[PDB]
């Protein structure tokens, strides 16, 4: 029904929000520290000097294990 | 249809996986460092000396800003 299409769209949008903002292909699993923005996969987070969201200096990257993974 | 019910169940399970594993009421927004398990809201994470998934000592809690929030 039309309700099935509405739920499919909500599911798709939630799943897309869990994907890396740089490559759009891999799951987010890395946090820029200390700012806390958690928006990249490990490969994309590895060479960034500053956060792509807030421009804060990246002191290090923390790997995250999420129950949605 | 029956697919509306199946999609409603998938959406609910994905949303539940984003909720704190301890209080079951607030969104996950905190990482236990250094292990990386990201399973709690800030209130439950502040009260735990050991990670509830792997039992490693919590050296500190990193707040995470996620696009799914
Ligand atoms: C971050 N974001 C939003 C939407 C998408 C997306 O549709 N990406 C396409 C690829 C194809 C294989 C994995 O997703 N990514
Ligand atoms: C008979 N039954 C048991 C569970 C459901 C169900 O989840 N229905 C889908 C709902 C209706 C509102 C849109 O999603 N139906
Ligand atoms: C972690 N988790 C799994 C399922 C649930 C759950 O159903 N929680 C109930 C509360 C009521 C207000 C917010 O969710 N939580
Ligand atoms: Zn990436
Ligand atoms: Zn940032
Ligand atoms: Zn909690
Ligand atoms: Zn742990």
How many structural domains are formed by the residues of chain A?
1
What is the beta-strand fraction of chain A?
5-15%
CATH fold annotation of chain A? Herpes Virus-1
Q: Structural class, from helix and strand content of chain A?
A: alpha+beta
Largest sheet of chain A: 2 strands, antiparallel
Give the class-level CATH name of chain A: Alpha Beta
Question: Which compounds are bound in this model?
Answer: ligand JGY, zinc ion
- Output the strand order for the largest sheet of chain A: 1-2
Distance between the termini of chain A: 30 Å
**Oligomer kind:** homodimer
Task: List the total number of helices of chain A.
Answer: 2
**Spatial extent as radius of gyration of chain A:** 14 Å
> What is the CATH architecture descriptor of chain A?
2-Layer Sandwich
Helical proportion of chain A?
25-40%
Listing every helix as H and every strand as E from the N terminus to the C terminus, the arrangement of chain A reads HEHE
The rough form of chain A would be described as: elongated
Number of strands of chain A: 2
**Largest interface: pair, residues per side:** A-B, 29 and 29 residues
CATH homologous superfamily (4th level) name of chain A: Zinc/RING finger domain, C3HC4 (zinc finger)
PDB class: ligase
Keywords: Diamond I04-1 fragment screening, PanDDA, XChemExplorer, E3, ubiquitin, Zinc finger, ring, ligase
Assembly: dimeric
Entry title: PanDDA analysis group deposition -- IDOL RING domain in complex with Z2643472210
């Amino acid at each position: 029904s039309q309700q099935t299409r509405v739920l499919q769209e909500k599911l798709r949008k939630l799943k897309e929000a869990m994907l890396c903002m740089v490559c759009c292909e891999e799951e987010i699993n890395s946090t820029f520290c200390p700012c806390g923005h958690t928006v990249c996969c490990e490969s994309c987070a590895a060479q960034l000097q500053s956060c792509p969201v807030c421009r804060s200096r990246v002191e290090h990257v923390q790997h995250v294990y999420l129950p949605t993974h």
